[PDB]
Each structure stands twice: as structure tokens, then as C-alpha cells.
Write a protein that binds this ligand. Structure first.
Ligand SMILES: COc1ccc(CN)cc1OC
Length: 281
């Protein structure tokens, strides 16, 4: 059981050691499309690339590339798109991916500015009456409503395909209180946020995969998917304690490199799953 394993690693201070075994065991697959010189300005970080086998392809003949990966968790019947925070030049590609994949929710785990630098382009409208048009991808985005709470904001957006005049409602879930350094002290507000995404229907098989991002799409984004999948597996299996976080993380790392960036994020993931299990048992 992971609660016991938690106290062991914690009392022994072995987090950096566990974290290193994960780095050494992790899959390595080609990422040739990401490294093409024509894609250099579609990547926020030169060392964070989608694998070719799991990359999301845009349906535009010109250049199909976006820094985005499909995570498929077969046993949990869960799928997530993990992506980077869009760049000024990829905001149109981001919304094209949301459209093409039939996603219902976007989960954002960063602020636009952190540590005095831009981590993400402002890719949604700030006011109802000021909609955004993405000329490159022929989409219009309107803010319908915004509900600001202490730890997170939920926004209802309307995405319109200008080519076909179809419209869809997208939910934007914005976790606004992840600290600039380190991890939250308590996982309570993060669990509340994760249960709110679940309640919306955004993680349900009747929609395309949820889009999850932070700045690189590997650290905070990784914690989100890892916690959701682990808690789901605990409700599915005859023996809940058969759930090994480290195994689940290694499975997800077959689909996108580097998920969970620090030993602190790993410890936080254990804590979130351990605490979430109480509200699930
Ligand atoms: C909605 O369907 C499911 C989603 C997840 C699981 C988890 N093993 C089982 C399901 O069966 C129905």
C-alpha cells in the first residue's frame, strides 16, 4: 500500500532516489517530426518534444505539427491530450486541435505570467464583447461566462467553425493558485479542482480527450493525469492497493516524455492520490 510506501520514502528522504529510478526506466521513442527545422518555432522548449507515435496531427495539409501527445490509459478507459502552453504563433493551431479532436474541456494549470516571464499566450478572450478570430485556422472564440473562485476559474467559451458555421461549447478550467516555486502544501484545492473537471463531463468517453496544459505540458499536467488515472483505477479494481503510482507513471511516459519534472511533483502526486482515496472509499 502506497500510504506505507509514502512514509518509508518520506522518513528515509528517498524521493530524489525513487525519482531517478523512474527517469532511468522511462521509455525513449523517436521525435523526428518535432526536430524538423520547419517546426522549430512551434516548440516552446527545444528539449520537450512529442514522440512521433503518439503526437496529435492537425488536419491541415501544409504542416500537421503541434507539440501535443495523446495519452491513452486502456485499463482506466481514459484519454488525455497533453500539450504546451500555446505560443503567439500557435494559438490558432491549439484551437484547431480542440475542434478536430472534439474535446469538451481545456485544463490550464499555469498563470500566463509566472516568475516575471510569459509561460503561455493569452489564447482566450478577456471580455464577452471582445471575441477572438484566428484567421490562419478560420475559428471564432467568444467568452460566454466566467466564474472566478479562490483557487480556480471556470469559463464557458463558444468555439465557432467559420467555414461550416457549427458551434461548440468548450469549458476552460483554470487552476490559478499553483505556486511559482515548488508544489501546493496541501492537495485539497487541487483535488476539488480535479473533481470539478470530472463533474463537468469533460473526462467522459462521450467526448474527445480533454486538453491539459501547463508551460511545457509535462510537470503540473503530468500530476493532473496521474492523479485522475490512479483514483479511477482504485474504483475499478477488486483490490484498490494493487495500484502502483510508479507503474502508472511509467505507462504514461510511453506516450509523452518527462511527465512529472521533480521529486517534489512525485511526492505531491502520491499525497493527492492518498488523500483522494479517502473521498473515494
Ligand atoms: C464509462 O465506462 C467506463 C469508464 C472507465 C472504466 C474504468 N475501468 C470502466 C468503464 O466501464 C463502463
Amino acid at each position: 500500500e502506497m500510504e506505507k510506501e509514502f512514509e518509508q520514502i518520506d522518513k528515509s528522504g528517498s524521493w530524489a532516489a525513487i525519482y531517478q529510478d523512474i527517469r532511468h526506466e522511462a521509455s525513449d521513442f523517436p521525435s523526428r517530426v518535432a526536430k524538423l527545422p520547419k517546426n522549430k518555432n512551434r516548440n516552446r522548449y527545444r528539449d520537450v518534444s512529442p514522440f512521433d507515435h503518439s503526437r496529435i496531427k492537425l488536419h491541415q495539409e501544409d504542416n500537421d505539427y503541434i507539440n501535443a501527445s495523446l495519452i491513452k490509459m486502456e485499463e482506466a478507459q481514459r484519454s488525455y491530450i497533453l500539450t504546451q502552453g500555446p505560443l503567439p504563433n500557435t494559438v490558432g493551431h491549439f484551437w484547431e486541435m480542440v475542434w478536430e479532436q472534439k474535446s469538451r474541456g481545456v485544463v490550464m494549470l499555469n498563470r500566463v505570467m509566472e516568475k516575471g516571464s510569459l509561460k503561455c499566450a493569452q489564447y482566450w478572450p478577456q471580455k464577452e464583447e471582445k471575441e477572438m478570430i484566428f484567421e490562419d485556422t478560420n475559428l471564432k472564440l467568444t467568452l460566454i461566462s466566467e466564474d472566478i473562485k479562490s483557487y480556480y476559474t471556470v469559463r464557458q467559451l463558444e468555439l465557432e467553425n467559420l467555414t461550416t458555421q457549427e458551434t461548440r461549447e468548450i469549458l476552460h478550467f483554470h487552476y490559478t493558485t499553483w505556486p511559482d516555486f515548488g508544489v501546493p502544501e496541501s492537495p485539497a484545492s487541487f483535488l476539488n479542482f480535479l473533481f470539478k473537471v470530472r463533474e463537468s463531463g469533460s473526462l467522459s468517453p462521450e467526448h474527445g480527450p480533454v486538453v491539459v496544459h501547463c508551460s511545457a505540458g509535462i510537470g503540473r499536467s503530468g500530476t493532473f493525469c496521474l492523479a485522475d488515472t490512479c483514483l479511477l483505477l482504485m474504483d475499478k479494481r477488486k483490490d484498490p492497493s494493487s495500484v502502483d503510482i510508479k507503474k502508472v507513471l511509467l505507462e504514461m511516459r510511453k506516450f509523452r516524455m518527462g511527465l512529472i519534472q521533480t521529486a517534489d511533483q512525485l511526492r505531491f502526486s502520491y499525497l493527492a492520490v492518498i488523500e483522494g482515496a479517502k473521498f473515494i472509499m
